Amino acid sequence: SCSDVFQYETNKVTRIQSMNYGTIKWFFHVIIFSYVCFALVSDKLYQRKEPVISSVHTKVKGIAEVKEEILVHSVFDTADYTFPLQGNSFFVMTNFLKTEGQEQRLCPEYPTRRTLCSSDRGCKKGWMDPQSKGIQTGRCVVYEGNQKTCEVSAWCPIEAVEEAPRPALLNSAENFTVLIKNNIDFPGHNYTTRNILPGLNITCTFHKTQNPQCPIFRLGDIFRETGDNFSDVAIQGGIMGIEIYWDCNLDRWFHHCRPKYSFRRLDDKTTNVSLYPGYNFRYAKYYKENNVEKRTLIKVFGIRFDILVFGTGGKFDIIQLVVYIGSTLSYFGLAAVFIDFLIDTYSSNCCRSHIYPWCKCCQPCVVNEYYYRKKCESIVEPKPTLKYVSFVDESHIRMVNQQLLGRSLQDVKGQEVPRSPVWCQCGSCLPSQLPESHRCLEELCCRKKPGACITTSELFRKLVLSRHVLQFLLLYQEPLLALDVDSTNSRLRHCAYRCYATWRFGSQDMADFAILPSCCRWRIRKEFPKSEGQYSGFKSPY
Amino acid sequence: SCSDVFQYETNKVTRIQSMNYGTIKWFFHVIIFSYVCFALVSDKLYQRKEPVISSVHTKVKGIAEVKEEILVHSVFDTADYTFPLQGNSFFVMTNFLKTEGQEQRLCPEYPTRRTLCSSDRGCKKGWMDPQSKGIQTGRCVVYEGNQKTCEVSAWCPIEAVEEAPRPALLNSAENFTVLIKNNIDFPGHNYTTRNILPGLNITCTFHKTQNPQCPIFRLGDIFRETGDNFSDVAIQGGIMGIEIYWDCNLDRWFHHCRPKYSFRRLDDKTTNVSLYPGYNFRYAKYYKENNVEKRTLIKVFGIRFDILVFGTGGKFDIIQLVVYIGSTLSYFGLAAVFIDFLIDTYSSNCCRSHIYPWCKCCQPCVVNEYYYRKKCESIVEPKPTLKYVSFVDESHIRMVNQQLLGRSLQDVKGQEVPRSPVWCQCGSCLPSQLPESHRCLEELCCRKKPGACITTSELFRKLVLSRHVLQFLLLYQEPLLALDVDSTNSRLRHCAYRCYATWRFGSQDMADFAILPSCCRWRIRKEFPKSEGQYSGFKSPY
């Protein structure tokens, strides 16, 4: 069946010369194409995108003169306020509280409404209060003279309950600078670059307009970019995020991979002591004095700077473009769908019985009846119960698609399709000579109301009973045809049924399932009788 | 050609009134639509998704009483067991081994099966053993009395080969808490939020059911969530991961962005000393005594906690929805594809010659023959070798789509299509008077087996030779038509060929490529001869 392989099925189409429908089609196509191109270009859907692999290296710079009422002036440098960047973050100490000479011993705990005692009964041995850095020994002792407080085993003397200094000791930390070196890679695209390129000015400091590509940031500038007071956030500390966004196109014609610097405060501006506002931690400087292990505890407050590097690098990928085009292809059939919907809707008689009289504007849309008739063809399932009846008086045909069960087809009305016995209205029918189960089918008249019969019509005699015509029809199909007398009569009788059905019902779709009236049936049978036997009747083709 | 632009091609369609096929179509459509909607909703394919940009800040809390057999009790606080979170991780020391008063000197290395010597020959000067922290000087000396061990230059005294203390010195570290503050951003969606919201209870501790949004975690609770013993993992250490998952919908109607906390052990539970089980490191406390640079070495064991923050934030995007709909649109033609497949398959005669007799269930599916005939029209390539022959005796036509090369078309049988000379079976043919290369074409008879001729048929004389009919056919196309005698004969002869071909082959598709038999051809030529010259014969239209 190689010939079956080498076959191409092309749809049958109707081409309409309509201003409106062609204009609609082209408008739809232009709009769809424009949106598809716009989406492709704007979202770069032709590109395979890869997240950035980043490495950050910071260099902080600046010294601070610190005033401490002990008054003494001291200079702090990088070794004293910062530690090298770890995990894309660096910390600059802005403030501190110091507690010198701590030994692991037993000491009276610093007085507070909790630790104040009036007798030994107010303390419990081994009690770990969450707001304490020690474990009670059960007895309370003098802190300073009159005042009695719970004794604890801990690093002693205990820290004073004091607030962070105001102003911050390292308030000059706003004039410090940080140089950020950012290296990025797209391993899939095998593209690595960096934020500092040859020819970049190193004598600059970042400004979002003047110097938007300078990687040297003054911390005060950052805070101002974000809308915060460095002098205030310095007192208790904070977290600031330096976002480096990489929107990179790796196509060599449209190549562009530069960073965009932005800033965002990352700590909640909470004043709730319960939530530990700011950013601080306790750091121990261990040492030895007089063979005793001692500790200087610094409560460090500062600002942690987080370098948040994110972005994508895109490069043209054939497969992504293919996928996007394939997804968008089906949107070009919507013009056809919409116009076919219009043709189907405006083909309904409802749109002229009611709609047009009200809205006369839509009257010219009646042409869609022509488009529908030239577009759609309707066919019914050729079931064995399917039947068609035509009445000469009536101006149409009836599709009786229901079982005739003890009910004459004359009285069994069905759906409306366009082009002596009690049930007889022409006076030329005979009772059905067939099984009473199916007699009702053959109990049909040429008409619904009394009057003349259609077997009297002069056309019937010449379009159904004319022997010359029927024999010529037989010869047309079979030029050299010879038959017995009975065979000739049978061939003629079947041709007569065929010709009547074609005459009254037209198309062969309805003439195959047509039903002849009893009058015409028996007239034809009389004209072309059979030698012996009984006539079978109607037989459904399928 | 503006009119050519303003054209709409609509497919010709056949509408079938079938219960089965309409039900199948609507079932397919409902299922496809339901699945498309389900996928869109479940995977939120209408949303553009953006990975989370996270910042974590931890605050650990708790003190531990530590027993060391030197027995001495000591209190450890945050300054003694933890360092501020770096890179989304914090470390809590749970155990330690201490080696005090180390000087860079020469010392006997701690005894092991490796370092035990019996003479100086067992050591090599400058030898860096991987299991050693020193470099041999070549000579071995007394470690403690009788026992001789390799001498090394190193920090001395060398560490003892001892196991981590059991129980862990800071085993109370399970009662410590950590408050995690997590800030997240979606820069593309310009949406930042945090894990602690106003009105959240700070007096809580996390419980996956009671307190699933409390960011205060007791370390023992974490280990239990994961199914581990804090007391065991404390001895040698470990790594625990605190996963914060953000499934965030940023649509204001369906907005939801809260974290989901989970826990996962991140260290292999390996007991293989070769793989360095646990988590430990050697930390040096440098100091000065007697103007000598000394070191206290602590082998620190603890649990490193990694805060693993991941997730996506989605917001409705028009383009993503368009793409998804476009991808899913083509699935609505599968009903048509499947039903057309059914109509094509059940139209085959194979499905009734064999299938129906066996499986009588499928007999009612014969109606698809009607659907096929009303659906598909078949046409062959009008090649110059294409030819059609009809034999009056035969009940069909033959498509001889092959070159007749010295072989009379009578004997050259081809494919089966439905509706005196040695090769003559009617006794009314003449030899072909044309080039012998193509004579074989015109060497055709009206029939395949002996008998009468079809030129004798009464229809032929009236449908091919009747001058009145032919002149009327000519006049129909050309009402006022006048011709010369020879021109009249030629017009009539061609009309006779046309009418015979239409009579026997029917459609003009087959009548254009039809071939008249020699008998009929020469009868027609005799009826309508030409004044002079020889008859050309058949000429392929294409």
Add this chain to the structure above:
Amino acid sequence: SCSDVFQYETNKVTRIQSMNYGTIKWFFHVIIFSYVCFALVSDKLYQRKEPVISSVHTKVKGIAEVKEEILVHSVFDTADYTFPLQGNSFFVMTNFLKTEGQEQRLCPEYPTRRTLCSSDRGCKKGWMDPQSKGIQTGRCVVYEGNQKTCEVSAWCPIEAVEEAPRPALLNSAENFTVLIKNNIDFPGHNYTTRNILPGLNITCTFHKTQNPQCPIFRLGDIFRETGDNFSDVAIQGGIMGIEIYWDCNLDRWFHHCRPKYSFRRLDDKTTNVSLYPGYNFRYAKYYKENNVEKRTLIKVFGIRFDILVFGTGGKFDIIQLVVYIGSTLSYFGLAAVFIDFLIDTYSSNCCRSHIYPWCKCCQPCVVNEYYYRKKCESIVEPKPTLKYVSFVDESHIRMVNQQLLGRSLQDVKGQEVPRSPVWCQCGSCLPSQLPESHRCLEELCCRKKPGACITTSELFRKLVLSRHVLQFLLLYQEPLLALDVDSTNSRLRHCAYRCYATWRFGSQDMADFAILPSCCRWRIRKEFPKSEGQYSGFKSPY
């Protein structure tokens, strides 16, 4: 209207038995299918992919003998050159400069072209020079004998301006090893694994061919992999990245999740002192001597190693496959689109008037005229101005789709379609007896140039004026039909218009909008006159 629901519209198609077009269709289909399968397989578009969640744990190993000209030999171990991995990075000190015994005091700043003074006027009190670690007191003092330099408040003595030692003190750091343990998770796929599996050899060191899965890396090996000198990068320092790529398939049949190790230098190989080449930082060792707070400052140079873990884990997802198939489905209609384009193009007369004479190769493609005629049907908008005129002399018909406004239709020529009064060319027409606004329509002749009339044609009399024929046509539609005399004449006259229009214009599409010539119109009206009144004329069906 449940029957309307139970309807299936199937496209009418034409099946072509062409070698070329079937071969083209199957070639297109095979190519499209092959590419779709290839893209699906290669990009694993059936898979849902999830980024990796990673945790890294390093263990560095090795000791270094360090020579310092003070010459003194010292051994450095892990406690002396590295700190535990923080944020997926570890640092190994390779070199250092030491400045012992620093006190916060006033000191002469180290001499440079900047700090050299000749008098007190060269210094400004409180001046913070960016290249200084102190704040000037306004006066300059002796540094060493003759040489005078600006005095500053700072940690003193000030650091010497000296270069990093050559060779690096810890140049043996290339023989150090690092064991990397990498744990990964795909939470969506609920799949966690690790880079070290049971049965892996721990006595190995990484080699990209011999030992590609060993997680023990010698730092010198890394530098060589990247193409760098450890001895040079050690002097000032650097950043090296150890990339661990995870291309993981989580399908149990095709499961594979192993790491791929690669190396990349992450620091710019810049020699520009202005950009701070290398990797170094200043670290303070604080201590106490004689109750004085002192500092040993180490300028640390080393190599920071960044463990860069990236990758995706994919697992089969039904929805992704559905989406991809839906996107690719519309590419299977391109064969139809292309072949229909060919059939439309090769159907044009332009392709035979010009193209074929030049390029005779393309002559056999004329069959596409047959394919077009059997494929496309063209229909015009049935506007009320649409009209068709046929002239017996002419060999075609004219579609006059324009308003006849005071211009006889005889002289109003329109588009070309295939099959006594001054404007009369047959001598058998009469002036139009209708409103002069529309008389011009009825002012049409049977012909364009002088001669006989078509009302004289014998067919016209029998195909338009034969009463027997017309009454038979009426009876065919209405077998039993009785009419009044005037009604009979009207029915016959309209049937005559219908039959002439069908005879001359053929299809009813053109015969509904046909216009009869004045001669034929008035001949028919004379044959079948009306009892009283005036004839209305032509009426557009739509």
